[PDB]
Amino acid sequence: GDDRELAILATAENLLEDRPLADISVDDLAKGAGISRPTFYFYFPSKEAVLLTLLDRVVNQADMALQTLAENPADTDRENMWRTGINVFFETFGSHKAVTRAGQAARATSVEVAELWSTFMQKWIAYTAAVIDAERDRGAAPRTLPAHELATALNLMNERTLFASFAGEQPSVPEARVLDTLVHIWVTSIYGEN
Amino acid sequence: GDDRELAILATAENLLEDRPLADISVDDLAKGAGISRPTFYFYFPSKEAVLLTLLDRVVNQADMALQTLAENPADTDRENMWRTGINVFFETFGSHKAVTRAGQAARATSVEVAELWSTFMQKWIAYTAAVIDAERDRGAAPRTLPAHELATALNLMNERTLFASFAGEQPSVPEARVLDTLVHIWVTSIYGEN
Ligand SMILES: O=C(Cc1ccccc1)N1CCC(c2nc(-c3cccs3)no2)CC1
Ligand SMILES: O=C(Cc1ccccc1)N1CCC(c2nc(-c3cccs3)no2)CC1
């Protein structure tokens, strides 16, 4: 039941490391999970549904880690504050590269995946803008661009840049340089008078 | 011949405004171009080949405009220099939204389109890094991040941000705000000591 469903999810995540979702059959998933094909269909309507659940788990894990960070005070310089925040996403998605990659690809073909990604991007943009606004209210950051517009561009940069790095795309920032790269761009753009 | 090929390309660009390439038949393209289906196949092997040519034309048009800008001196403040450069791409791709949209989608399914996009991104990143390097050599910009890494993140931000704006994605920066938004992030990140 719960353990049969988890075994399907774990199998799917494992197989996605080696091949595209298109190259993975419902048969592969059932076999990996130690169940029959008809039993698989009790837990999931399709392999696409399995990917959606995997993506949902990872995105919620990132979101929850951001929430935990946000709850703490927690005495730090402004650059370190943003670095710790971006790190939540670097570590969470970077620890689930196969799911990250497959989930991004599915945005083109699945309305559910597209909606899921959109929902969480809006949430993360809103939180970013709220923190920028707080920084401005404090006198710590200058009142330059509309905070929400600035937040949107910075979050879209993170999406494209982190994911190109994880996929080893040509061009991409090396994974070992991408955190410092994004942090510099966030800090200078949020705190820079010009 | 040359005019038959141009009519196919123009027809394809027109139909892409209204529907996905998948919703456009070779029949539609031939009919729009005033030719038969077998005659279409003389000029192009597939509708995918038509999209590749459309994308190639637009990307080269942007690249050539950047070259022209780069040839001039041409007495300006640093913010305006970068604004004029980003504007080349905003105007070129923004004047061909349907081709831009379809070309980006085809990156997932066409190695030729993927390679084309990669080639020009590497070129634009290299040019960006060269200009940053020149600015540093001048004493105009500080020696912060590796120029090529900074250039890569800024160009990936432009790709994701411009194209989300043109597509009206949720989330996206409004098209009427995206130029100012990207310029601020470029200027602060290139010239900001922190
Ligand atoms: O990188 C992201 C989100 C993202 C990750 C991957 C792909 C697209 C978007 N963020 C969103 C939230 C942003 C943020 N951090 C914080 C805080 C950090 C520390 C205390 S609050 N507030 O907003 C950090 C960077
Ligand atoms: O926006 C882009 C490229 C791009 C556009 C869309 C999608 C992805 C990438 N660029 C690349 C070149 C960059 C640049 N401008 C210049 C100069 C401007 C004026 C004189 S040189 N040098 O590099 C401007 C911004």
Chain B hits for A184, CB-CB cut-off 8 Å, are 144-145, 150, 189
Query: A176: cis peptide before it, omega within 30°?
Result: no
Please name the residues in contact with A51: beta carbons below 8 A apart, sequence gap of 6 or more. A12, A16, A21, A99, A102, A103, A106, A110, A113
Rounded CA-CA distance A83/A46 in Å is 38
Rounded CA-CA distance A66/A84 in Å is 9
Cβ-defined contact of B189 to A191 (cutoff 8 Å): no
The full set of domain ranges for chain B reads 1-46, 47-194
Burial of residue A26, with CB atoms counted within 10 A of its CB: 0-12 exposed, 13-18 middle, 19 or more buried: middle
Experimentally determined by: X-ray
Cβ-defined contact of B157 to A185 (cutoff 8 Å): yes
How far A86 CA sits from the closest chain B CA (Å)?
Answer: 14
The number of C-alpha atoms within 13 Å of A171 and in the hemisphere containing its C-beta is 24
Rounded CA-CA distance A155/A49 in Å is 26
Question: Resolution for this model in angstroms, one decimal place?
Answer: 1.7
Please name the residues in contact with B190: beta carbons below 8 A apart, sequence gap of 6 or more. B82, B132, B135, B141, B150, B154
Listed residue (A54, A48, A55, A57) closest to A26, CA to CA: A48
Residue nearest to atom 1 of ligand 1 (CA): A86
Cβ-defined contact of B185 to A157 (cutoff 8 Å): yes
Q: Which residue of A has its CA nearest to B125?
A: A171
CATH of A47-194, one of 3.20.10.10, 3.40.50.300, 3.40.140.10, 1.10.357.10: 1.10.357.10
CATH number listed for the domain at residues B1-46: 1.10.10.60
The number of C-alpha atoms within 13 Å of A148 and in the hemisphere containing its C-beta is 8
Rounded CA-CA distance B109/B103 in Å is 10
Backbone phi, psi, residue B24, to 5°: -110, 125
